[PDB]
Amino acid sequence: IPTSALVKETLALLSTHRTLLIANETLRIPVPVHKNHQLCTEEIFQGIGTLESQTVQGGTVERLFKNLSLIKKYIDGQKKKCGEERRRVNQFLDYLQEFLGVMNTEWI
Amino acid sequence: IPTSALVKETLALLSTHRTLLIANETLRIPVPVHKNHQLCTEEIFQGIGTLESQTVQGGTVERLFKNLSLIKKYIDGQKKKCGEERRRVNQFLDYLQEFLGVMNTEWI
């Protein structure tokens, strides 16, 4: 369905399985000191991995881990679409402007 | 002077210098086909060093390239800040609901 809809759902599932997930008091997982989230997508996804390995594979927990794999592959698909069209320097420059605009408008 | 001031400078600078940089009419740089700008930061920094080696140095365009080197050392700082604190599982989960929140309710 809409990945859009699936985020909204994956949020609900995280929520109904926290006791199970938090029960492991020894795991120490990688958490980012900052809020520019899109730069840490893959210390985030090796974190869902160490979770997943230490977790009892209990039937409904799996549609949580299943939804997080369908969001992984899509980020990975977009990281791929990063270096794929080769365009002229004015198109690269408008894009780079647009990236600096975001740093100045959105970050920190 | 500070990283946020530098981001304001570099944008002024890129707009000043467009004509010098599009004079490379033959150069073809990889441009992302989507707007999730921050997944592609290191394909963007590869695009700038190519442009850096196709342009006359020594004039006013060297502030743009020296700035852009600084902004990249800033992002490389934020990035190793993504995995230097190892902390407990419920704290890892709190970063994950924000991450999924941003994806739906605030995505760039």
Report yes or no: A32 at the B interface, CB cutoff 8 Å: yes
Judging by beta carbons within 10 Å of its beta carbon (0-12, 13-18, 19+), is residue A26 exposed, middle or buried?
Answer: exposed
DSSP B59: S
State how far the alpha carbon of A16 is from the alpha carbons of A72, B90, B99, in Å.
21, 13, 17
SS3 B83: coil
Of the residues A92, A99, A104, the best mutation for testing chain B's interface (the one with the most B CB atoms within 10 Å of its CB) is A92
∠ CA A98-A99-A104, nearest 5°, is 95
Comparing C-alpha atoms, which of A28, A33, A50, A32 is closest to residue A41?
A: A32
In order of start, what are the domains of chain A with their CATH numbers? 1-108 (1.20.1250.10)
Q: Give the containing element (helix H, strand E) for B64.
A: helix B61-80
DSSP string of A17-60, one letter each residue: THHHHHT-SS-EEEE-SSS-GGG-HHHHHHHHHHHHHHS---TH
Q: Are B29 and B50 in contact (CB under 8 A)?
A: yes
Give B17→chain A minimum CA distance, Å: 10
Q: To the nearest 10°, the Cα dihedral for B21, B23, B24, B26?
A: 140
| Elucidated via | X-ray
d(CA A91, CA B80) in angstroms, rounded, equals: 30
* SS3 per-residue string spanning A68-99: HHHHHHHHHHHHHCCCCEEEEHHHHHHHHHHH
d(CA B73, CA B66) in angstroms, rounded, equals: 11
Q: Closest residue of B to A76, CA-based?
A: B39
Comparing C-alpha atoms, which of B54, B48, B61 is closest to residue B12?
A: B61
